[PDB]
Amino acid sequence: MKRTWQPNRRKRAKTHGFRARMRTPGGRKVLKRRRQKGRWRLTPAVRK
Amino acid sequence: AVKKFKPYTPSRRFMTVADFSEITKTEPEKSLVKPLKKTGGRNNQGRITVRFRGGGHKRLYRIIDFKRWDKVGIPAKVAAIEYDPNRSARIALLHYVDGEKRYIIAPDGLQVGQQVVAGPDAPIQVGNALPLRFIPVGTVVHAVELEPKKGAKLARAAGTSAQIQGREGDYVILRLPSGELRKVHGECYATVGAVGNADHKNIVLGKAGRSRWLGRRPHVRGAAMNPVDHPHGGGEGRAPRGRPPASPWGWQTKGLKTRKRRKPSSRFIIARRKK
RNA sequence: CGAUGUCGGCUCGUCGCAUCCUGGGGCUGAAGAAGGUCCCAAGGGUUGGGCUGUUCGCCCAUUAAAGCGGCACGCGAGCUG
RNA sequence: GAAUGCCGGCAUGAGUAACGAUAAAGAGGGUGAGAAUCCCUCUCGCCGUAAGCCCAAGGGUUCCUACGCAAUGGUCGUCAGCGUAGGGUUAGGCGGGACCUAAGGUGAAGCCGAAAGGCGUAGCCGAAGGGCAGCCGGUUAAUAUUCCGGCCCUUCCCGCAGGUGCGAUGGGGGGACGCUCUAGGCUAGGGGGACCGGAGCCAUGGACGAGCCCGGCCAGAAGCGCAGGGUGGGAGGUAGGCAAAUCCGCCUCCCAACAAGCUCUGCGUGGUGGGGAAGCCCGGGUGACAACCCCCCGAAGCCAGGGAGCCAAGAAAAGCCUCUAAGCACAACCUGCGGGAACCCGUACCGCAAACCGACACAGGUGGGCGGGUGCAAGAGCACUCAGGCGCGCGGGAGAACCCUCGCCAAGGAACUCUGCAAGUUGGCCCCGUAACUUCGGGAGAAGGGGUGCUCCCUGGGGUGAUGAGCCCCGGGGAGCCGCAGUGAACAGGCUCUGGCGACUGUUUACCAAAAACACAGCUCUCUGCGAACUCGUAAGAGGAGGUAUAGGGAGCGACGCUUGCCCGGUGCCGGAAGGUCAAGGGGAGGGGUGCAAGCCCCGAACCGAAGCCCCGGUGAACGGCGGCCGUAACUAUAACGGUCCUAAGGUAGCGAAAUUCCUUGUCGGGUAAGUUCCGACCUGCACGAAAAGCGUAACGACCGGAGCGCUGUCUCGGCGAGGGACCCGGUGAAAUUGAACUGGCCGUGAAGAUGCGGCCUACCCGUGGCAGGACGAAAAGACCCCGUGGAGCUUUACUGCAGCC
RNA sequence: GAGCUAGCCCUGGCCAGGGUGAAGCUGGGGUGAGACCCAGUGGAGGCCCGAACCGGUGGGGGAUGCAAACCCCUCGGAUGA
RNA sequence: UGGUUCGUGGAGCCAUGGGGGAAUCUGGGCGGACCACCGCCUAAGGCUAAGUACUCCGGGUGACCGAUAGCGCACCAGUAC
RNA sequence: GCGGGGUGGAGCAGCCUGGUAGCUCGUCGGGCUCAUAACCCGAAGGUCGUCGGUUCAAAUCCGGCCCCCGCAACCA
RNA sequence: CCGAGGGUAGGGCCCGUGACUGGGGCGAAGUCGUAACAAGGUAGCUGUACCGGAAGGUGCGGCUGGAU
RNA sequence: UGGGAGAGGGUGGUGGAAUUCCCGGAGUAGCGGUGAAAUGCGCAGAUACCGGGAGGAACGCCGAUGGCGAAGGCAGCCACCUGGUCCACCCGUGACGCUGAGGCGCGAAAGCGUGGGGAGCAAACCGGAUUAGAUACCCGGGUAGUCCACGCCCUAAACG
Ligand SMILES: [K+]
Ligand SMILES: [Mg+2]
Ligand SMILES: [Mg+2]
Ligand SMILES: [Mg+2]
Ligand SMILES: [Mg+2]
Ligand SMILES: [Mg+2]
Ligand SMILES: [Mg+2]
Ligand SMILES: [Mg+2]
Ligand SMILES: [Mg+2]
Ligand SMILES: [Mg+2]
Ligand SMILES: [Mg+2]
Ligand SMILES: [Mg+2]
Ligand SMILES: [Mg+2]
Ligand SMILES: [Mg+2]
Ligand SMILES: [Mg+2]
Ligand SMILES: [Mg+2]
Ligand SMILES: [Mg+2]
Ligand SMILES: [Mg+2]
Ligand SMILES: [Mg+2]
Ligand SMILES: [Mg+2]
Ligand SMILES: [Mg+2]
Ligand SMILES: [Mg+2]
Ligand SMILES: [Mg+2]
Ligand SMILES: [Mg+2]
Ligand SMILES: [Mg+2]
Ligand SMILES: [Mg+2]
Ligand SMILES: [Mg+2]
Ligand SMILES: [Mg+2]
Ligand SMILES: [Mg+2]
Ligand SMILES: [Mg+2]
Ligand SMILES: [Mg+2]
Ligand SMILES: [Mg+2]
Ligand SMILES: [Mg+2]
Ligand SMILES: [Mg+2]
Ligand SMILES: [Mg+2]
Ligand SMILES: [Mg+2]
Ligand SMILES: [Mg+2]
Ligand SMILES: [Mg+2]
Ligand SMILES: [Mg+2]
Ligand SMILES: [Mg+2]
Ligand SMILES: [Mg+2]
Ligand SMILES: [Mg+2]
Ligand SMILES: [Mg+2]
Ligand SMILES: [Mg+2]
Ligand SMILES: [Mg+2]
Ligand SMILES: [Mg+2]
Ligand SMILES: [Mg+2]
Ligand SMILES: [Mg+2]
Ligand SMILES: [Mg+2]
Ligand SMILES: [Mg+2]
Ligand SMILES: [Mg+2]
Ligand SMILES: [Mg+2]
Ligand SMILES: [Mg+2]
Ligand SMILES: [Mg+2]
Ligand SMILES: [Mg+2]
Ligand SMILES: [Mg+2]
Ligand SMILES: [Mg+2]
Ligand SMILES: [Mg+2]
Ligand SMILES: [Mg+2]
Ligand SMILES: [Mg+2]
Ligand SMILES: [Mg+2]
Ligand SMILES: [Mg+2]
Ligand SMILES: [Mg+2]
Ligand SMILES: [Mg+2]
Ligand SMILES: [Mg+2]
Ligand SMILES: [Mg+2]
Ligand SMILES: [Mg+2]
Ligand SMILES: [Mg+2]
Ligand SMILES: [Mg+2]
Ligand SMILES: [Mg+2]
Ligand SMILES: [Mg+2]
Ligand SMILES: [Mg+2]
Ligand SMILES: [Mg+2]
Ligand SMILES: [Mg+2]
Ligand SMILES: [Mg+2]
Ligand SMILES: [Mg+2]
Ligand SMILES: [Mg+2]
Ligand SMILES: [Mg+2]
Ligand SMILES: [Mg+2]
Ligand SMILES: [Mg+2]
Ligand SMILES: [Mg+2]
Ligand SMILES: [Mg+2]
Ligand SMILES: [Mg+2]
Ligand SMILES: [Mg+2]
Ligand SMILES: [Mg+2]
Ligand SMILES: [Mg+2]
Ligand SMILES: [Mg+2]
Ligand SMILES: [Mg+2]
Ligand SMILES: [Mg+2]
Ligand SMILES: [Mg+2]
Ligand SMILES: [Mg+2]
Ligand SMILES: [Mg+2]
Ligand SMILES: [Mg+2]
Ligand SMILES: [Mg+2]
Ligand SMILES: [Mg+2]
Ligand SMILES: [Mg+2]
Ligand SMILES: [Mg+2]
Ligand SMILES: [Mg+2]
Ligand SMILES: [Mg+2]
Ligand SMILES: [Mg+2]
Ligand SMILES: [Mg+2]
Ligand SMILES: [Mg+2]
Ligand SMILES: [Mg+2]
Ligand SMILES: [Mg+2]
Ligand SMILES: [Mg+2]
Ligand SMILES: [Mg+2]
Ligand SMILES: [Mg+2]
Ligand SMILES: [Mg+2]
Ligand SMILES: [Mg+2]
Ligand SMILES: [Mg+2]
Ligand SMILES: [Mg+2]
Ligand SMILES: [Mg+2]
Ligand SMILES: [Mg+2]
Ligand SMILES: [Mg+2]
Ligand SMILES: [Mg+2]
Ligand SMILES: [Mg+2]
Ligand SMILES: [Mg+2]
Ligand SMILES: [Mg+2]
Ligand SMILES: [Mg+2]
Ligand SMILES: [Mg+2]
Ligand SMILES: [Mg+2]
Ligand SMILES: [Mg+2]
Ligand SMILES: [Mg+2]
Ligand SMILES: [Mg+2]
Ligand SMILES: [Mg+2]
Ligand SMILES: [Mg+2]
Ligand SMILES: [Mg+2]
Ligand SMILES: [Mg+2]
Ligand SMILES: [Mg+2]
Ligand SMILES: [Mg+2]
Ligand SMILES: [Mg+2]
Ligand SMILES: [Mg+2]
Ligand SMILES: [Mg+2]
Ligand SMILES: [Mg+2]
Ligand SMILES: [Mg+2]
Ligand SMILES: [Mg+2]
Ligand SMILES: [Mg+2]
Ligand SMILES: [Mg+2]
Ligand SMILES: [Mg+2]
Ligand SMILES: [Mg+2]
Ligand SMILES: [Mg+2]
Ligand SMILES: [Mg+2]
Ligand SMILES: [Mg+2]
Ligand SMILES: [Mg+2]
Ligand SMILES: [Mg+2]
Ligand SMILES: [Mg+2]
Ligand SMILES: [Mg+2]
Ligand SMILES: [Mg+2]
Ligand SMILES: [Mg+2]
Ligand SMILES: [Mg+2]
Ligand SMILES: [Mg+2]
Ligand SMILES: [Mg+2]
Ligand SMILES: [Mg+2]
Ligand SMILES: [Mg+2]
Ligand SMILES: [Mg+2]
Ligand SMILES: [Mg+2]
Ligand SMILES: [Mg+2]
Ligand SMILES: [Mg+2]
Ligand SMILES: [Mg+2]
Ligand SMILES: [Mg+2]
Ligand SMILES: [Mg+2]
Ligand SMILES: [Mg+2]
Ligand SMILES: [Mg+2]
Ligand SMILES: [Mg+2]
Ligand SMILES: [Mg+2]
Ligand SMILES: [Mg+2]
Ligand SMILES: [Mg+2]
Ligand SMILES: [Mg+2]
Ligand SMILES: [Mg+2]
Ligand SMILES: [Mg+2]
Ligand SMILES: [Mg+2]
Ligand SMILES: [Mg+2]
Ligand SMILES: [Mg+2]
Ligand SMILES: [Mg+2]
Ligand SMILES: [Mg+2]
Ligand SMILES: [Mg+2]
Ligand SMILES: [Mg+2]
Ligand SMILES: [Mg+2]
Ligand SMILES: [Mg+2]
Ligand SMILES: [Mg+2]
Ligand SMILES: [Mg+2]
Ligand SMILES: [Mg+2]
Ligand SMILES: [Mg+2]
Ligand SMILES: [Mg+2]
Ligand SMILES: [Mg+2]
Ligand SMILES: [Mg+2]
Ligand SMILES: [Mg+2]
Ligand SMILES: [Mg+2]
Ligand SMILES: [Mg+2]
Ligand SMILES: [Mg+2]
Ligand SMILES: [Mg+2]
Ligand SMILES: [Mg+2]
Ligand SMILES: [Mg+2]
Ligand SMILES: [Mg+2]
Ligand SMILES: [Mg+2]
Ligand SMILES: [Mg+2]
Ligand SMILES: [Mg+2]
Ligand SMILES: [Mg+2]
Ligand SMILES: [Mg+2]
């Protein structure tokens, strides 16, 4: 059937994108948390 | 009149539509229309704040002149009478001798080609707007301001009207469409005559779709819901109310008066409404 | 109760006998024929339909007879639902 | 040594299931260590409104070539979307940006919030909407509207010339709009051609033919032509379009007006540039100096901002045109011409799939465009087939049971079963014909029947031509011919009668319920006078609504017809400047502590004192409720009638063994040979009843009963056949489960159902195909049940609080 | 976290072919004028049949699946909520 | 109302959202309701090292571990997935 | 299995709170009327379901038995 | 070709009959009330509407075939 | 041709008395109703009185045994539109007449549909009396309806 993952590059960057994270306290905390963990990528990769 | 159909489909059996006899122009004045922003009953939080709304026909908002005392003493010609989707009334296109074109809601019996005028010295004839004090007591009137210069707020719906009952100091006594008796300031403008298109209420939608065309989404009874949703929710099989009939939000909805008693306007309301 | 699937139907049998029919009998208020009643007998047999989910039961048309029970109310790693 | 323990390793099941659509293969020749599987050829089959092609998402080098086969590939592999290396994506015109706005987002000003933050007009951002300039062909192994060739065009900059009151983020016009139907003319596309060009072809009985097979175009500026969109001209006044205005708007006048003119597109032509098949010679050469014409069909596409009708009344902003303001009129803008300038990103490849979403090379899911021909009434349906693409990445055998999908069946014809479940039957089109009842629409495809092919003769009307031939579209009548059968194949209703429910089309439990449930137009109650009520929010602010009682919220009821009774004691709600109660506060008769005292301090009665409650009323389409015993009629039975107890009042009309009836398969009728169902009745209604509506109702229903007809493999009752499996061989090779096992029957025993204990009986060792009685077989720490001072959802006149409101 | 799903908002797109024949308009009859009747034209509709497309009614298969919802046959809607 | 051991308690102290609202030393606060006496202190402005907390980093040391341990990671790990 | 009830002839008080049986109808007797009904005036009639126990004393309180009507009977 | 007729299918009319139901007509002395006839003790009658055990009552209009 | 009387019809307007309600003022212990009463209303200030408003329906006196109309029926007053009818003059046309199965129209009250309106009245309904009963007559309330517009219904002691 139709499944849950319907990739959409714009939707990805707009929802989980770096600029989206930064615009919000919780999202900055995400970036902070992910940096502190030493995540190689802070934000999902998407080709714009 | 109101137009009936032959029962050539189940829905067409009872459906009635407006006769559109008074309509002389079938497109609006381009400079007097802005796009209407459909809400879907959602407020700026994106929350449904009025239920069961949306999906209706696209509409363009016709700017309506609810002041009229802008152009005092300047008469206008009733150039056309048109369809307005945003209200029950008809709207009359005015071509002022000024060159300015505006809309008013069209009063009953108002005729295309006639002249109308606004002001204290205006004649007492249909389509003219005057401050209430200069209008004879007992005269039928619509599009009445509630406060001076604040805009026509009263009796604007199709077939509605108010009647001037008398005078008291700086205020006049109106009988509003609701039957409520009220003190309205004398300096409030109003148009002599009743709102036209009285047959509006004789319209039988006929079928569900007609409701949807109007942006009125299906309304679901509380009785048909579950207790999480609504005080009338639950019960095995059908249930009677089982409590005082109530809203989804729990307040009582059969007789429970809800206007604020301490409202400053209570001093100006002579008699509560009718039936 | 870290599960022994629960009615009935179907299918498939198999067993018991308190025997429904067939076989052998005694007694009879057994003339004959047909019955009643008991005893011996489990070899085989024991129909098709209307109604109900029905087991059962009533009814129809027959029949030598249209038996009653057990097998986890036999049988859902066989099926039905 | 155990924790259904944790991590890992390795077993068992087992050479077992399976190897992923039943569209299908066979042979020859290559390559190579090795080939059913890679390459080539021929034959066969499949798709062809796709299973072909193009585009967008998404993917990200998967593209091309070379060299490879460890792993990946459900087998194999020499092949590959795999490994390694090299190469490949070219734009002013395509897309996106350097343009515009949409919802929304963000947000000068501003508002709000303990903080974080929430808002918010303008502005900005934001597209698959608007606006905007490239078409045809050639080329590469791989890119092409991008490179090249021809023919075109856009913007910016500067210069020249002519013109002009030039000048904007300002004003104005315009952009600018739905749905259904649709005219005229074109094209795209298609069919035919006795015409034109073309390698050849004469087979096997005939055919050298007016034969067969193949092809008969594409792009193109100005101009002209055809069709169409858009647009009135002039003057006078002007007070509106937040300044201005010669513009727009309004008034008046003349001129003219389904014309024309001017303008703008589509189409045809058009200098020019292309392209060009079958066949046989190895993607190429040839054909070829290819020809490149006529007729017909013809769009849903084009002219397109066309027209008509309708109600539900159908974006914005820029580009563009016009107007004026600062300014400026050496400027500046317009027009034409010339030269120069024109950036950033995408561009490979897959793209209904083996490269996207599904853990897989997964029978699933994925928007837009093109989608040829013939026939069947039409069509995107159906069968075949073109272009093109495929035979689905395990095979070879065999010809059991059994399973799946499939075909047929004598006689019967639902006897099967909970049920005609399933499968039959019916099946398109034309004609004839069609009942109750009805809301006059319908019920209708009711039912039921006839016709249907092919050949010859005669003929009627239309489209295109021209009024005619030819072509094409409907037809009508004659006479014939063949078959078992003519919508000869594929696709294409079984019908009827009668109840229950719901009016109806719709909606729902994604993934066990599609229903009688939800919605529904309609009805009635109730709230709400507008800074509405109500909703979200601490707030600001929003929705409501740029609405105004013919409007909005809430609730019930559920088209329609006829209706909707009595109870206001209780609860609810509504009304009630009395009275009773009532908190803070006001008051301070009067006490009290301390102080040598003034004083300080504490307590404190009467009275005044809000809502709320109490109290007086009203209120049912508000919550709800609508009796008991006993007796009486010139037969019995019954009780129109009476007596009496209680009630706030005692169930009205209608309907009733019901979707409700316990007794119950009530009784009686109907239908049947037989009817626990059904239909109709009756009424002592365990336990109907009037908007949680009552009783009806045409039409409708993949709803649920009952019946008949039709027809059948459902059945009596089974048989045979087909293919895909099951079986055999080669290849690859799982799984849950598993204390260990050397794992028989009976009668016992045993924690009460024993392969494992006793006694007896039986039994050589080991498998294969099958069956499912047992291993209280597997699976899931029973969802029922109880327990726990476990949890959660839900309720309320349980408790206690909180919002909200007073 | 609304790339699934539910609603709403904004902007686009899709719906072969056939059937039925409402209003209106015209003509005719009618009448004092009418209502009305007839015929033609017309092309309405949560109208009818039926693909795409959206569904998911009944049955079978599947059930360590092709698939953690699929396949076949069948069936609902298909200008509209 | 909050803080303190103080949960309304005889509830002072400190802090303050609301109402009322002084004085400048003969002023004012405090010593646990209050009053008297005896005393303590000087509100309504601000600053101030050190002694204290911590270990991302460097070093030293262990009756700490020794690759299922020790950090999640001894290894190209916040990686592959 | 649980509740309520049994009292002049009929229907209901009294029982709770022991001593005292009452209301309406009916029945009888007398009136009015030509007569009946209505109406008027009088009167009777229960020993309280039944047996036991408590009490000085039982319709009353308690227990058992007959009765008479209601209500229940769920999880499978 | 026509064709008696047989068969299939659906209509129309008529008659008989049917659980039950609806009132009607008649039936020596049944139960309840007393609506009408005398102003019948509320003048009657009436068309219609609603209601009630029943006659009946009531509303709105009408009539006199009513007043004394 | 000239003239007359008339609640004939239709439309729009508009006037006063009264009833009810509401507000304001004054005022107190009852008012109301009946055969007599009760219910009901009233110290929460009713009745009775004066002033203010709102609203609906019906038109007193004239008014008669009267007039009009085909009937049903028609009554404050104004205006507009319109029918019928009588008279007079003796002008015109020359039997153009009478009746009328069907048709068609009109048709009191009640009733019905969709709206509006609703003061008074009042079926139904409730209550208080009466009564053996009283689903009646009398009393206190009260919903349809009475009223308007449009559409139906088409009956009558539609009678002279
Ligand atoms: K249970
Ligand atoms: Mg996933
Ligand atoms: Mg994207
Ligand atoms: Mg996108
Ligand atoms: Mg997106
Ligand atoms: Mg973002
Ligand atoms: Mg890194
Ligand atoms: Mg992130
Ligand atoms: Mg209609
Ligand atoms: Mg109109
Ligand atoms: Mg605009
Ligand atoms: Mg927002
Ligand atoms: Mg938001
Ligand atoms: Mg709401
Ligand atoms: Mg909404
Ligand atoms: Mg309008
Ligand atoms: Mg609408
Ligand atoms: Mg609803
Ligand atoms: Mg529910
Ligand atoms: Mg919720
Ligand atoms: Mg709730
Ligand atoms: Mg409820
Ligand atoms: Mg119920
Ligand atoms: Mg319920
Ligand atoms: Mg409630
Ligand atoms: Mg509220
Ligand atoms: Mg009011
Ligand atoms: Mg158990
Ligand atoms: Mg088990
Ligand atoms: Mg179980
Ligand atoms: Mg004998
Ligand atoms: Mg004998
Ligand atoms: Mg014997
Ligand atoms: Mg035997
Ligand atoms: Mg049986
Ligand atoms: Mg049994
Ligand atoms: Mg039985
Ligand atoms: Mg015998
Ligand atoms: Mg048993
Ligand atoms: Mg069993
Ligand atoms: Mg089973
Ligand atoms: Mg079973
Ligand atoms: Mg079941
Ligand atoms: Mg151990
Ligand atoms: Mg395990
Ligand atoms: Mg093995
Ligand atoms: Mg095995
Ligand atoms: Mg598989
Ligand atoms: Mg395969
Ligand atoms: Mg090959
Ligand atoms: Mg390999
Ligand atoms: Mg290698
Ligand atoms: Mg592999
Ligand atoms: Mg391999
Ligand atoms: Mg594989
Ligand atoms: Mg090799
Ligand atoms: Mg270029
Ligand atoms: Mg630049
Ligand atoms: Mg922008
Ligand atoms: Mg913001
Ligand atoms: Mg953005
Ligand atoms: Mg764009
Ligand atoms: Mg472009
Ligand atoms: Mg071009
Ligand atoms: Mg200019
Ligand atoms: Mg517009
Ligand atoms: Mg439309
Ligand atoms: Mg055309
Ligand atoms: Mg063709
Ligand atoms: Mg001007
Ligand atoms: Mg100006
Ligand atoms: Mg050549
Ligand atoms: Mg035109
Ligand atoms: Mg147009
Ligand atoms: Mg805008
Ligand atoms: Mg100069
Ligand atoms: Mg110019
Ligand atoms: Mg740049
Ligand atoms: Mg490219
Ligand atoms: Mg596609
Ligand atoms: Mg692929
Ligand atoms: Mg594969
Ligand atoms: Mg696939
Ligand atoms: Mg066809
Ligand atoms: Mg294959
Ligand atoms: Mg074999
Ligand atoms: Mg057969
Ligand atoms: Mg048969
Ligand atoms: Mg049957
Ligand atoms: Mg069977
Ligand atoms: Mg069934
Ligand atoms: Mg059946
Ligand atoms: Mg067929
Ligand atoms: Mg037929
Ligand atoms: Mg033939
Ligand atoms: Mg069909
Ligand atoms: Mg039934
Ligand atoms: Mg339903
Ligand atoms: Mg339905
Ligand atoms: Mg549902
Ligand atoms: Mg479901
Ligand atoms: Mg579910
Ligand atoms: Mg699920
Ligand atoms: Mg299912
Ligand atoms: Mg359905
Ligand atoms: Mg409905
Ligand atoms: Mg209704
Ligand atoms: Mg809220
Ligand atoms: Mg608004
Ligand atoms: Mg509903
Ligand atoms: Mg309902
Ligand atoms: Mg009917
Ligand atoms: Mg009550
Ligand atoms: Mg009350
Ligand atoms: Mg009450
Ligand atoms: Mg009711
Ligand atoms: Mg109650
Ligand atoms: Mg009653
Ligand atoms: Mg019954
Ligand atoms: Mg019942
Ligand atoms: Mg029963
Ligand atoms: Mg029976
Ligand atoms: Mg029986
Ligand atoms: Mg019987
Ligand atoms: Mg049944
Ligand atoms: Mg009975
Ligand atoms: Mg209810
Ligand atoms: Mg109810
Ligand atoms: Mg019914
Ligand atoms: Mg029906
Ligand atoms: Mg259905
Ligand atoms: Mg078979
Ligand atoms: Mg086979
Ligand atoms: Mg392998
Ligand atoms: Mg035992
Ligand atoms: Mg054992
Ligand atoms: Mg042993
Ligand atoms: Mg032993
Ligand atoms: Mg077994
Ligand atoms: Mg088993
Ligand atoms: Mg556990
Ligand atoms: Mg357990
Ligand atoms: Mg469990
Ligand atoms: Mg238990
Ligand atoms: Mg415990
Ligand atoms: Mg608990
Ligand atoms: Mg969504
Ligand atoms: Mg989405
Ligand atoms: Mg079509
Ligand atoms: Mg069509
Ligand atoms: Mg149509
Ligand atoms: Mg349809
Ligand atoms: Mg398509
Ligand atoms: Mg299915
Ligand atoms: Mg089926
Ligand atoms: Mg199955
Ligand atoms: Mg499954
Ligand atoms: Mg499928
Ligand atoms: Mg359809
Ligand atoms: Mg204490
Ligand atoms: Mg304290
Ligand atoms: Mg102290
Ligand atoms: Mg403070
Ligand atoms: Mg001091
Ligand atoms: Mg202090
Ligand atoms: Mg101190
Ligand atoms: Mg002290
Ligand atoms: Mg101190
Ligand atoms: Mg100080
Ligand atoms: Mg320090
Ligand atoms: Mg160690
Ligand atoms: Mg060591
Ligand atoms: Mg480690
Ligand atoms: Mg270790
Ligand atoms: Mg480390
Ligand atoms: Mg680790
Ligand atoms: Mg990672
Ligand atoms: Mg007592
Ligand atoms: Mg006593
Ligand atoms: Mg005598
Ligand atoms: Mg007497
Ligand atoms: Mg004693
Ligand atoms: Mg005693
Ligand atoms: Mg005693
Ligand atoms: Mg329970
Ligand atoms: Mg014959
Ligand atoms: Mg009488
Ligand atoms: Mg009488
Ligand atoms: Mg009398
Ligand atoms: Mg009388
Ligand atoms: Mg009389
Ligand atoms: Mg009675
Ligand atoms: Mg009455
Ligand atoms: Mg008389
Ligand atoms: Mg007083
Ligand atoms: Mg003469
Ligand atoms: Mg003469
Ligand atoms: Mg009337
Ligand atoms: Mg009438």
Side-chain angles (χ1 to χ4, degrees), chain B residues 92-184:
Chain B
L93 203 204
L94 298 181
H95 289 175
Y96 285 76
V97 305
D98 225 35
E100 180 152 12
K101 300 182 177 174
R102 348 236 283 200
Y103 279 122
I104 62 165
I105 50 192
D108 195 273
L110 184 279
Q111 271 302 350
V112 46
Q114 85 162 70
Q115 189 138 308
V116 286
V117 71
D121 65 321
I124 311 305
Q125 263 109 39
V126 164
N128 282 336
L130 307 88
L132 277 165
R133 31 191 292 185
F134 303 78
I135 319 192
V137 321
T139 43
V140 287
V141 141
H142 66 269
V144 196
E145 291 197 296
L146 201 34
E147 283 176 297
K149 302 293 170 261
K150 268 185 195 202
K153 303 295 209 131
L154 272 38
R156 318 190 329 188
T160 49
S161 62
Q163 195 179 233
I164 312 187
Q165 291 315 100
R167 297 188 178 91
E168 163 154 329
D170 291 289
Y171 283 78
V172 314
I173 296 166
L174 296 190
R175 200 215 289 116
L176 301 186
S178 77
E180 167 184 292
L181 280 181
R182 208 210 210 275
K183 286 176 186 173
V184 182

Side-chain angles (χ1 to χ4, degrees), chain A residues 6-15 45-48:
Chain A
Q6 308 298 332
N8 174 304
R9 290 161 148 96
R10 174 193 250 257
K11 163 80 187 178
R12 192 142 174 95
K14 281 228 161 186
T15 302
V46 52
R47 273 161 160 269
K48 321 290 169 59

Side-chain angles (χ1 to χ4, degrees), chain B residues 39-242:
Chain B
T39 53
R42 275 96 171 147
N43 73 348
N44 58 20
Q45 295 162 344
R47 296 280 177 98
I48 295 162
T49 48
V50 175
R51 309 140 84 221
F52 313 129
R53 266 172 143 83
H57 204 301
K58 190 168 182 176
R59 296 179 181 174
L60 252 41
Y61 182 73
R62 286 107 178 107
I63 308 170
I64 304 301
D65 178 24
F66 285 119
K67 294 190 210 174
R68 287 268 252 144
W69 42 255
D70 279 309
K71 317 201 60 57
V72 182
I74 320 177
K77 171 153 98 203
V78 173
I81 287 170
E82 302 168 30
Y83 188 87
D84 190 348
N86 306 116
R87 53 188 42 79
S88 57
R90 300 315 191 211
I91 58 179
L93 203 204
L94 298 181
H95 289 175
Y96 285 76
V97 305
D98 225 35
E100 180 152 12
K101 300 182 177 174
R102 348 236 283 200
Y103 279 122
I104 62 165
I105 50 192
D108 195 273
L110 184 279
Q111 271 302 350
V112 46
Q114 85 162 70
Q115 189 138 308
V116 286
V117 71
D121 65 321
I124 311 305
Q125 263 109 39
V126 164
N128 282 336
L130 307 88
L132 277 165
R133 31 191 292 185
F134 303 78
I135 319 192
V137 321
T139 43
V140 287
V141 141
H142 66 269
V144 196
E145 291 197 296
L146 201 34
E147 283 176 297
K149 302 293 170 261
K150 268 185 195 202
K153 303 295 209 131
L154 272 38
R156 318 190 329 188
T160 49
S161 62
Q163 195 179 233
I164 312 187
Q165 291 315 100
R167 297 188 178 91
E168 163 154 329
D170 291 289
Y171 283 78
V172 314
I173 296 166
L174 296 190
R175 200 215 289 116
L176 301 186
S178 77
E180 167 184 292
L181 280 181
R182 208 210 210 275
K183 286 176 186 173
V184 182
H185 203 275
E187 286 296 315
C188 283
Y189 266 70
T191 308
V192 357
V195 176
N197 194 22
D199 256 25
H200 169 62
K201 69 192 198 177
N202 293 334
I203 284 178
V204 178
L205 293 197
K207 69 175 182 179
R210 202 96 120 81
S211 280
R212 307 305 303 281
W213 300 346
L214 303 169
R216 301 199 254 252
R217 295 188 54 232
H219 191 116
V220 21
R221 299 163 296 105
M225 311 177 171
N226 289 325
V228 262
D229 306 313
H230 197 286
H232 300 175
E236 283 274 311
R238 309 212 178 101
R241 266 49 90 200

